């Protein structure tokens with residue numbers, strides 16, 4: 001199991017020690033407060049009122065937690081995933097990323113605390 | 122394992138099928154959008170900017186997800202719990218509850234989708 005912080009201003013994302021293999025079942029829990037600029041802060045689901053202006057993941061709100069598995073496209077994580085199985089053709093190391101517009105991570109603040117575990121399968 | 126919705130306007134709380142027993146390790150993942158009154162909506166962590174005016178759980182923000190276990194007091198759940206063990210002498214059925222002031226649930230809206238499972242020990 002992996003546990004760590006994902007900083008909102010980390011454009012490259014946080015690499016985990018988790019390698020998703022075909023058939024794996026995983027659970028993720030994410031908590032905390034972060035911002036993509038404003039003085040306010042949002043949780044792992046991000047800001048539901050902010051328009052998508054070129055987010056790295058169009059399937060989640062700005063300020064949400066998302067992930068990549070290997071060289072996949074971005075996948076929404078939000079508050080987390082419960083005993084979750086990846087789509088076929090997806091496999092590799094899990095990198096966690098704060099959802100923002102590329103090149104704009106500089107003024108981000110806060111972070112999410114995240115646990116990732118592999119479940120029984 | 123249990124999966125279900127916890128309505129924000131349910132003052133009595135949502136009873137689950139989970140009975141917490143001594144030594145149990147559990148994981149919870151909660152997601153969604155709810156409100157304790159305003160047109161705006163907040164995730165499972167609630168509204169970090171709203172003052173506590175007599176909430177059923179003083180250890181969580183207004184609009185956060187909390188729980189009771191048997192006859193325990195309220196325990197914060199927020200976005201969820203990862204492989205979590207209960208405090209001493211805490212056991213019994215798990216009931217999930219939206220954190221609000223007693224007698225004011227009437228104007229609440231939305232809900233959280235919640236998964237609860239027991240982990241291997």
Ligand SMILES: O=[N+]([O-])c1ccc(O[C@@H]2O[C@H](CO)[C@H](O)[C@H](O)[C@H]2O)cc1
Pocket residue numbers: 036037038051052053062100101104105107
């Ligand atoms: O026009 N607004 O209401 C508005 C409010 C907040 C804004 O924050 C902006 O969001 C961008 C992403 O969408 C970038 O994250 C940028 O760093 C940030 O300042 C940008 C515009």
Ligand SMILES: O=[N+]([O-])c1ccc(O[C@@H]2O[C@H](CO)[C@H](O)[C@H](O)[C@H]2O)cc1
Pocket residue numbers: 157158159172173174183221222225226228
């Ligand atoms: O003083 N305010 O700014 C203020 C704004 C919104 C408020 O919503 C209020 O919150 C209460 C809990 O603290 C109750 O949930 C009440 O039903 C709700 O209308 C209550 C007060």
Ligand SMILES: [Ca+2]
Pocket residue numbers: 035036037100104105106107108
């Ligand atoms: Ca930003």
Ligand SMILES: [Ca+2]
Pocket residue numbers: 157158221222225226227228229
């Ligand atoms: Ca209310």
